Amino acid sequence: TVAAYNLTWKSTNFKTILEWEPKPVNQVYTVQISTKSGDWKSKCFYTTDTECDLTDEIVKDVKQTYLARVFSYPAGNGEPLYENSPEFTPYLETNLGQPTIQSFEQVGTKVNVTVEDERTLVRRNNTFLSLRDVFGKDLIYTLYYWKSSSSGKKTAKTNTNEFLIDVDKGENYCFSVQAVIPSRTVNRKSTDSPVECM
Amino acid sequence: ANAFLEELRPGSLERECKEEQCSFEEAREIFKDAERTKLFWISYSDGDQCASSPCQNGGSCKDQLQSYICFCLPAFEGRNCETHKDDQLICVNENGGCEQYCSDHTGTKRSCRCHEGYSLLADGVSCTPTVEYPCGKIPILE
Amino acid sequence: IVGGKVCPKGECPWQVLLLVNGAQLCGGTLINTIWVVSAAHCFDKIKNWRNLIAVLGEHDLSEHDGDEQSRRVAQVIIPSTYVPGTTNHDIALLRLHQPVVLTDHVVPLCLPERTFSERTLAFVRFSLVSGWGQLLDRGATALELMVLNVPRLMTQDCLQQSRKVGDSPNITEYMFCAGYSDGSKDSCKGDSGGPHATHYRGTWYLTGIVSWGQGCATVGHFGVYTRVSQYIEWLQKLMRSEPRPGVLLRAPFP
Ligand SMILES: *[C@@H]1O[C@H](CO)[C@@H](O)[C@H](O)[C@H]1O
Ligand SMILES: *[C@@H]1O[C@@H](C)[C@@H](O)[C@@H](O)[C@@H]1O
Ligand SMILES: [Ca+2]
Ligand SMILES: [Ca+2]
Ligand SMILES: [Ca+2]
Ligand SMILES: [Ca+2]
Ligand SMILES: [Ca+2]
Ligand SMILES: [Ca+2]
Ligand SMILES: [Cl-]
Ligand SMILES: [Cl-]
Ligand SMILES: [Mg+2]
Ligand SMILES: [Mg+2]
Ligand SMILES: [Mg+2]
Ligand code: NA
């Protein structure tokens, strides 16, 4: 057998997939995951894939710190060869999903811009929780907007999923939004939403 | 996006880009600014990665930049919801849910067994003592 | 045991104290009413083979109470492959001359099937180790039975996390590491032969035997325990064998 290598956590909105190399040649893999003090749970038994969905184990506690390891077994079938993953803490490290502007509405001399609730893989009682359900006050949304006839850009920030911004009357404005966890120093922002204009 | 009589008006994002497909330069002429144009184009030209319907087993797809996320029904997992939880009843998966011993039976269901001093309950997995002091239990607690 | 707790009386009811000429020798584990598992190395210096006693139901070595049961050891069975003074195949199977009586203070630990032990019990992170060994490396032994929770490592991790020591023993397929590298908690010499016991879904099982280490609770080192899963078939066959006339038997392995 050969040991797995380049083990990498791919995780967005808690959908979390461990990836590794190499493509198997006369070997198969099984993955195990644990927390530092907990038991090892096996996943992806004898797979020929070079990936393993671990979402269902990590959503049980997103604030825990998980370690995974990938075992290599020779085809047809001591301790096996294996490689450990980086540690992963999902609340701290999951990517924030690309957001969508849900609506905008002219009310007064102002425009409300509403961000669609971002759905995550964490379940509560047959429902997927939103990013704001999971992160609460650690999550903000940021709005990049401009008046088309002007140079330069404006930004607003919200603790909810809505922005109420002042606009000059009879003018068109375009908008784009990001999810942000300001307390992070790495992977602090989603990609920008598609741009929507009046 | 060219048909000559339809080209008579000044630029319109609605006309050029939302009712029709526009090229990067057409969008640039509308937005003018480099970063405003970039912000729009990065998403507009990205495509819907959910269009190929990658989520299996009744999962739901959400589009992202050059990527998607599948949200699975409870009985499924995997990047594309391809793994049936119901088909993973095997001994290396949490001891096949057996309390004590687990035996794989290929083609058919695994079975559960017990150590001497115990017998297998009607439930097919759980074990009960058949003697006063079975091995491996601490009676002073119970 | 270094950095453990007193095992409340009766809570480690499979623990065995072995004596030779009435003096503390080693620990062991009761696995049914007649058979005890201990470490081969415990026997390297024995001259008086007919003077070995197993004590069940022991707790406090300074006071007798009515829960202790002593039985003469009739046979000590060690793999032929074991070499005195070395670490590999460090296991001994002991036949008691008369059975103990099981009581609230005297209960056997389950010896598991091999495959269950390799595929399931080996991935339960923590297990308990116990004995009346030294409370510090090169220190005095304990009068009350002591118990410690230790996490298990696969051998690759144990090699990668262990300080290099010139000419140290190999960690073989017949061993595993468990414990803590930070100098705080470990089994020790006088705990040799005692159980490393693993709890799984309401039943406790024998997974290891206290065997060796670099000192006790040395920084950069784990304890090493005989990997009992490799011996299940060997033990089960020998427990079906007829007794022989002398105490020591070296039996082929596998
Ligand atoms: C279209 O569908 C395939 C799998 O069926 C997937 O690979 C793509 O990523 C998706 O957009
Ligand atoms: C999307 O989410 C998944 C979980 C299923 O409930 C689908 O029916 C829905 O469209
Ligand atoms: Ca048109
Ligand atoms: Ca056009
Ligand atoms: Ca144009
Ligand atoms: Ca043009
Ligand atoms: Ca897309
Ligand atoms: Ca006593
Ligand atoms: Cl949200
Ligand atoms: Cl006797
Ligand atoms: Mg239109
Ligand atoms: Mg045009
Ligand atoms: Mg131009
Ligand atoms: Na240590």
| Contact status, residue C190 vs residue C216, Cβ threshold 8 Å | no
- CA within 13 Å, CB half, C79: 24
The single residue listed with the structure tokens 């996320």 is B69
* 3-state SS, residue B5: helix
Give A98 to chain C, closest Cα distance, Å. Answer: 38
CA distances from A186 to A92, A95, A116, C154 (A): 9, 10, 24, 32
Q: Are residues C189 and C126 in the same domain?
A: yes
Task: Please indicate the experimental technique that yielded this structure.
Answer: X-ray
Which 8-state DSSP code applies to residue C202? T
| Contact status, residue C54 vs residue C25, Cβ threshold 8 Å | no
Domain positions in chain B are 12-142
Q: What is the CATH number of the domain that holds C207?
A: 2.40.10.10
- Specify the number of domains making up chain C: 2
Ligand 1 and B49: CB distance under 6 A: yes
Q: Which ligand is closest in space to the CA of residue B66? A: 7
Q: Are residues C51 and C124 in the same domain?
A: no
Ligand 2 and B59: CB distance under 6 A: yes
What is the C-alpha separation between A15 and A134, in angstroms, rounded? 14
**B44 — contact with chain C (CB < 8 Å)?**
no
Nearest CA in chain A to B74: A126
Angle formed by the axes of helices B24-31 and B34-44, to 10°?
140
- Specify the number of domains making up chain A: 2
How close is the Cα of B71 to the center of ligand 1, in Å? Answer: 15
Q: Are residues A50 and A144 in the same domain?
A: no
Give A54 to chain C, closest Cα distance, Å. Answer: 18
Q: What is the CATH number of the domain that holds A79?
A: 2.60.40.10
Domain span at residue C48?
13-108+230-243
| Contact status, residue A70 vs residue A54, Cβ threshold 8 Å | no
| Contact status, residue C57 vs residue C135, Cβ threshold 8 Å | no
What is the C-alpha separation between A32 and A30, in angstroms, rounded? 7
DSSP labels for C116-167? HHHHTGGG-SEEEEEES-BSSTTSPBPSB-EEEEEEEE-HHHHHHHS---TT
Angle ∠(C17,C43,C150) on CA atoms, nearest 5: 55
| Of B136, A191, A184, A172, nearest in space to C116 by CA | B136
Neighbours of A129 (CB within 10 A): 21
Specify burial of residue A39 (Cβ count, 10 A radius: 0-12, 13-18, 19+). middle
Q: Is C104 one of the annotated active-site residues of the chain?
A: no
**B34 — contact with chain C (CB < 8 Å)?**
no
**B99 — contact with chain C (CB < 8 Å)?**
yes
How close is the Cα of C8 to the center of ligand 8, in Å? Answer: 13
